[PDB]
Write a protein that binds this ligand. Structure first.
Ligand SMILES: Nc1ncnc2c1ncn2[C@@H]1O[C@H](COP(=O)(O)OP(=O)(O)OP(=O)(O)O)[C@@H](O)[C@H]1O
Lengths: 241, 245, 245, 238, 53, 53, 232
């Protein structure tokens, strides 16, 4: 085998390290980002739950990297940690330098470059983490992206990474309508998350949620994390609980 | 084997098989022929095309290192960009330092110094190139003091002066022909048709100016890389000569 | 054996040891008889330097080297490797003389040398030494002789011996303690060294030897290191010749 | 086994990494460059995967280095990314030093030089990308189309295909194209570039991407509607 | 030495275990000599010098 | 018996072919020289190699 | 095994290095040269090998300085790096101490240099012998450099291919050529006879002879062509 390092290729010119790093994302739970006309909703899944586990101090797969762009996380979390910080620091470096907030495409481009750079040179490991970037910039309004652990990005109107990628993708696109209401965006997220997930009863503590809107509080990109007691309500509207 | 996985590791023969192997890279690249005369050295080459869409008039394999020092090459061109780069710098830094023409021989050594570099470090020549060079040069020029000289700079070994040398793919059959057809009585015009005559023999292609390129070092004419018409004219004379015979 | 242990020199075996350091010692076995004879008013060094053929020049190559002007050293094993440890000793010795304005104590030298050897077992981009080094001199607190193993072990020695014929050499030293319970004068311990090395040459009998003897003695060399040569050395030769026959 | 480093050679003199890099190009979609008498059209296969995927926010296969140099690529998308920004800066640094618009020769030679530098090194791989660097200059009216290869070797060719199933597309282009007569008009340059691409797309007239570069710093990227008139024009003659 | 059967590895079936090494430097020169006394010898030959090789 | 093969039907006048001549022909013509030197004349040979040579 | 043959930092079980041993093999494959000396003169005579007869030879003598120089046997790249380091040392000595550094003192620095690449991980070992000559206040000297890096002071030596017949010649005539002092012709003469004996597949020509001589009244001078026409 030729999986000894990033430098070395197989006969066919593929690199196994990239391949393993894709597979790493799908051994941690489903993550779904939906863009809609009236907001972009992010929703993610808890791969951990113990009866004495707490998860009310923090979301372990959602970080705001700037006051206008936030990311949902899929992969190993230690690997995740390093990069979340690198991105958020780079964001504010842009803010310091230009006195305005970072455009989405630059932010994604920076992290895929860093991730590729670890493949291109040295001994350092590639870091298999897939971020779903949901942002607003005046270039293309709402923008939903994801980053590959292969170290490039693609724009989206919906994407799912994490566990059950095939399952999440067809289900989301079947009930996609070009428009989409932000309430329906929420309703859809919960429905696809139940089916994918092997915990029969999808409760609010198995859910992370944020909705991102400039259609609420106009002239201002406002990202808002839902609290448990709000998540608890919407489950009763979708009839899970 | 096992002695081609270390560059500081010798064979039970006392040799380096990493280096040995780089000789076969030199041989892999297409044939180059140089022939020194008492009037100038004529440097001819082979090129290859697979499509006519290849611009054959805007590719390099005879390169100008100075206006009186020229070179041919054979082997990997990835390695050659770097090799030719170093050697340009030396000629220029000599005129920087001195206001006088570099020596052909002296240039030959400097090139081989960059060739020596296989790893990192080493005193009196800090090594920055990480693998064996896969490129050789036929180095032809003129300093007054030693007239017109032809060397073959060998990254594996060190430099050997030649009075005529063929490298590349067609080297073994050429060398024998070049024994029987290097003289101390060669003229520059005759040398020109000689080079083409030897090239054709070992070229399994068609002789044309599109895959050939003559050039001379004549110290009174400067380094002149030839035109397509000019070389075409030499292809034409060659054919009338050998038709009569 | 394999699996580390003898392939790397910082990796330990289940035996709690390293087999490469045993191999470092084995190269000492292969090296030639060197003794140091501690005395109560000096120290004496003798060495057997074999003669390979008679084209060699007489008394012009040694293994006796000096540090400062009062510390003699001689190494057995691998010759060019043994030079470099003494050379490294000099650089260390020089630093002591700079900072403290005084010659080095022989127990100070023994500590610094043993750190240098021990370092070459902590890294794996390094090779160990493969030499023992008998050394010592006279200082403040008198004469001291130490001997350093390629192991990085040392202890004080009333007699030190290394090289191939050291079995004979160690027995003769112990006889020397018994016959003279002060270890004899430094003048006669030179002669005593010659009788040892000649018997040690019954283990090396196939070729010829050259006896080089040096000393450093409290009042017989006036606290300085010098080579033992001329009528002193001629004496040693003669005493030694007499006493084998 | 001699395909483990770029400091170990085979008895034939190859570094299989470069050879396996050329197979990597083939993973990335085709790109085709063809020059005319007063233009170069740099045309490429584009991918439309899903309704969710966009085009606005979803990378183009053409990136414009500057206003008088353009660049297409084929290979892995991540590798070309670092190379393009790197290429763009190099292109700027020309003007910074010299104060002149970037030469196309200068650009192909440095950019593959970055590739070359990596290949020369044994401790790091180079890129797995082959590019087309096409352009003009405000001084020179001669149209130029250059190539890079993953070895860090740059070559110049009148017309070339690289990328996915390039070889098959190549043979068709040889025949129609002549060094004695390239396409006279721009529209005709485009028709040939399209005829070549039809082959790789199978069907898909949103999947054929056309860009045109002419001298005096004219770069245009053609509307969807314009690309579509060619496809329909080529089917009536077909 | 690790193909020796356990039958004979028990005391009183072997008692002397006697090692033959690969001829050392001093040993090569002597072996070479006897081979050389089947054919003509000359003053040219120095076995010590062949043994080093 | 008596092949209809010579060193025209073999290409190359290889190194092995030059050492091959010495084994068969040379001590057959003259066993005198071998006797005097004090070597016992070559008569065994093993030709071996990859297939198709 | 020869699994200790994979490194330069790993001693074998018998306490050898295979790396230093293979380097001895490379001297043998290298071109023959003879050193010898007298109290007042020292000479290297070396066989100048061409790759063919369109090839105009190769210099086997590198001038180190005006009182030093070396010849080679084995690797040509290797002779080149250590010649650069050695030349720097001669310059250094002359710059800082106003002095022609003793041959033997010079030779301990080149010995270390070798052992640097023996100690370290990376660094190619050296697989060349150099015969060093010089003439200082302490007269002529002759050193034989090893690929180990050991230094041996002899009155006479030869290394390279077929060089053992030249050692048997010199041994016999050892005391003869030493006593000749103030006569370079004879010492020169001796080095020619030695290297006659070596020959196989070669005959001496004018341009196989390179004689390098330093002495009591002689600069380091390398003699070639019409000046070795009196000694062909
Ligand atoms: N030396 C040669 N001259 C001409 N042809 C040759 C030569 N060597 C091999 N060939 C061709 O190869 C054919 C088959 O190989 P051949 O019988 O010579 O080989 P081998 O290595 O002795 O074989 P095997 O493993 O079959 O015993 C011959 O019939 C002949 O045509």
């Amino acid at each position: 085998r030729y999986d000894s390092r990033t430098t070395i290729f197989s006969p066919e010119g593929r690199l196994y390290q990239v391949e393993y790093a894709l597979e790493s994302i799908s051994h941690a739970g489903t993550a779904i980002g939906i863009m809609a006309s009236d907001g972009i909703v992010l929703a993610a899944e808890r791969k951990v739950t113990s009866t004495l586990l707490e998860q009310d101090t923090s979301t372990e797969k959602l970080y705001k990297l700037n006051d206008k762009i936030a990311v949902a996380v899929a992969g190993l979390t230690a690997d995740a940690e390093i990069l979340i910080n690198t991105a958020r620091i780079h964001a504010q470096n842009y803010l310091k330098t230009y006195n305005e907030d970072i455009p989405v495409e630059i932010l994604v481009r920076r992290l895929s470059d860093i991730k590729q750079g670890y493949t291109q040179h040295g001994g350092l490991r590639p870091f298999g983490v897939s971020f779903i970037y949901a942002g607003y910039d005046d270039r293309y309004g709402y923008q939903l992206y994801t980053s590959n652990p292969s170290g490039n990005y693609t724009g989206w109107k919906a994407i799912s990474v994490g566990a059950n990628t095939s399952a999440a993708q067809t289900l989301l696109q079947m009930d996609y309508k070009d428009d989409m209401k932000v309430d329906d965006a929420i309703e859809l997220a919960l429905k696809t998350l139940s089916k994918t997930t092997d915990s029969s009863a999808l409760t609010y503590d198995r859910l992370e949620f944020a909705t991102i809107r400039k259609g609420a509080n106009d002239g201002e990109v406002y990202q808002k994390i839902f609290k448990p007691q709000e998540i608890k309500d919407i489950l009763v509207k979708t009839g899970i609980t | 084997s096992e002695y081609d996985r270390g560059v500081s590791t010798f064979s039970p023969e006392g040799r380096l098989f990493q280096v040995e192997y780089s000789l076969e890279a030199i041989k892999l690249g297409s044939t180059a022929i140089g022939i020194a005369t008492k009037e100038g050295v004529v440097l001819g080459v082979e090129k290859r095309a697979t499509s006519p869409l290849l611009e054959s008039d805007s590719i390099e394999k005879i390169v100008e290192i100075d206006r009186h020092i020229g070179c041919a090459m054979s082997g990997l061109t990835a390695d050659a960009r770097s090799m030719i780069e170093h050697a340009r710098t030396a000629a220029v830094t000599h005129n920087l330092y001195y206001d006088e023409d570099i020596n052909v021989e002296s240039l030959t050594q400097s090139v081989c110094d960059l060739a020596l570099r296989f790893g990192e470090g080493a005193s009196g020549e800090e090594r920055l190139m990480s693998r064996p060079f896969g490129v050789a040069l036929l180095i032809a020029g003129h300093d007054a003091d030693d007239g017109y000289q032809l060397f073959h700079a060998e990254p594996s070994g060190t430099f050997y002066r030649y009075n005529a040398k063929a490298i590349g793919s067609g080297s073994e059959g050429a060398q024998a022909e070049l024994l029987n057809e290097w003289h101390s009585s060669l003229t520059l015009k005759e040398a020109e048709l000689l080079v083409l005559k030897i090239l054709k023999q070992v070229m399994e292609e068609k002789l044309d100016e599109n895959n050939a390129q003559l050039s001379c070092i004549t110290k009174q004419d400067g380094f002149k890389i030839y035109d397509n018409e000019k070389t075409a004219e030499l292809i034409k004379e060659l054919k009338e000569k050998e038709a009569a015979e | 054996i394999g699996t580390g242990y003898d392939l790397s020199n910082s990796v330990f075996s289940p035996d709690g040891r390293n087999f490469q350091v045993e191999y470092a010692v084995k190269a000492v076995e292969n090296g030639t008889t060197s003794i140091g004879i501690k005395c109560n008013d000096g120290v004496v060094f003798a060495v057997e330097k074999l003669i390979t053929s008679k084209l060699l020049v007489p008394q012009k190559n040694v293994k006796i080297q000096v540090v400062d002007r009062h510390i003699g050293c001689v190494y057995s094993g691998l010759i060019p490797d043994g030079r470099h440890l003494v050379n490294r000793g000099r650089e260390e010795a020089a630093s002591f003389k700079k900072l403290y304005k005084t010659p080095i104590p022989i127990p100070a030298f023994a500590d610094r040398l043993g750190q240098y050897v021990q370092a070459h077992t902590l890294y794996n981009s390094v090779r160990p030494f493969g030499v023992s080094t008998i050394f010592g001199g006279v200082d403040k607190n008198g004469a001291h002789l130490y001997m350093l193993e390629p192991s990085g072990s040392y202890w004080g020695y009333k007699g030190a011996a290394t090289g191939k014929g050291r079995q004979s050499a160690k027995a003769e030293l112990e006889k020397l303690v018994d016959h003279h319970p002060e270890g004899l004068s430094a003048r006669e311990a030179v002669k005593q060294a010659a009788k040892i090395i000649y018997l040690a040459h019954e283990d090396n009998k196939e070729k010829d030897f050259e006896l080089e003897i040096s000393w450093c003695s409290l009042s017989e060399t006036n606290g300085l290191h010098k080579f033992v040569k001329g009528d002193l050395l001629q004496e040693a030769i003669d005493f030694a010749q007499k006493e084998i026959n | 086994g001699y395909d483990r480093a770029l400091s170990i050679f085979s008895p034939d003199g190859h570094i299989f990494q470069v050879e396996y890099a050329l197979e990597a190009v083939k993973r990335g979609t085709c790109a085709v460059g063809v020059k005319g008498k007063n233009c170069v059209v740099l045309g490429c296969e584009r991918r439309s995967t899903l309704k969710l995927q966009d085009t606005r926010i979803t990378p183009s296969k053409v990136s414009k280095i500057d206003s008088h140099v353009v660049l297409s690529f084929s290979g892995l998308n991540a590798d070309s990314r670092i190379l393009i920004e790197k290429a763009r800066v190099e292109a700027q640094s020309h003007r910074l030093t010299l104060e002149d618009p970037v030469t196309v020769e200068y650009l192909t030679r440095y950019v593959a030089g970055v590739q070359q530098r990596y290949t020369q090194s044994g401790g790091v791989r180079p890129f797995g990308v082959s590019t087309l660097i096409a352009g003009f200059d405000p001084r020179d009216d001669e149209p130029k189309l250059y190539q890079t290869e993953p070895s860090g070797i740059y070559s110049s060719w009148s017309a070339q295909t690289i990328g996915r199933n390039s070889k098959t597309v190549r043979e068709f282009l040889e025949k129609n194209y002549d060094r004695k007569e390239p396409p006279a008009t721009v529209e005709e340059c485009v028709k040939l570039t399209v005829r070549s691409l039809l082959e790789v797309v199978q069907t898909g007239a949103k999947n054929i991407e056309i860009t045109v570069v002419k001298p005096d710093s004219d770069i245009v990227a053609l509307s969807s509607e314009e690309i579509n008139q060619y496809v329909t024009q080529i089917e009536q003659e077909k | 030495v690790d193909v020796l059967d356990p039958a004979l590895l028990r005391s009183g079936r072997l008692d002397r275990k006697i090692e033959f090494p690969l001829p050392s430097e001093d040993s090569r020169a002597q072996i070479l000599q006897i081979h050389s006394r089947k054919m003509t010898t000359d003053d040219d030959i120095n076995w010590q010098e062949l043994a080093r090789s | 018996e008596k092949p209809d093969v010579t060193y025209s039907d073999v290409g190359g006048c290889k190194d092995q072919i030059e050492k091959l001549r010495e084994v068969v022909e040379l001590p057959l013509l003259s066993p005198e020289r071998f006797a005097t030197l004090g070597i016992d004349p070559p008569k065994g040979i093993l030709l071996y190699g990859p297939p198709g040579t | 095994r020869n699994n200790y043959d994979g490194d330069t930092v790993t001693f074998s079980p018998t306490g050898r290095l295979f790396q230093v041993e293979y380097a001895l093999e490379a001297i043998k494959q290298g071109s023959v040269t003879v050193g010898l000396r007298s109290n007042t003169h020292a000479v290297l005579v070396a066989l100048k090998r061409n790759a063919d007869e369109l090839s105009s030879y190769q210099k086997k003598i590198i001038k180190c300085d005006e009182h030093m120089g070396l010849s080679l046997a084995g690797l040509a790249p290797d002779a080149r790096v250590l010649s650069n380091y050695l030349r720097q040392q001669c310059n250094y000595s002359s710059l800082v101490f106003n002095r022609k550094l003793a041959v033997e003192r010079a030779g301990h620095l080149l010995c270390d240099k070798a052992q640097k690449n023996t100690q370290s991980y990376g660094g190619r070992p050296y697989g060349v012998g150099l015969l060093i000559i010089g003439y200082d206040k302490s007269g002529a000297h002759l050193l034989e450099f090893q690929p180990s890096g050991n230094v041996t002071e002899l009155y006479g030596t030869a290394i390279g291919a077929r060089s053992q017949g030249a050692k048997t010649y010199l041994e016999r005539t050892l005391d003869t050529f030493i006593k000749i002092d103030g006569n370079p012709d004879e010492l020169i003469k001796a080095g020619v006879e030695a290297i006659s004996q070596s020959l196989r597949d070669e005959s001496l020509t004018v341009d196989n002879l390179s004689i390098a001589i330093v002495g009591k009244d002689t600069p380091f001078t390398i003699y070639d062509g019409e000046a070795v026409a009196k000694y062909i």
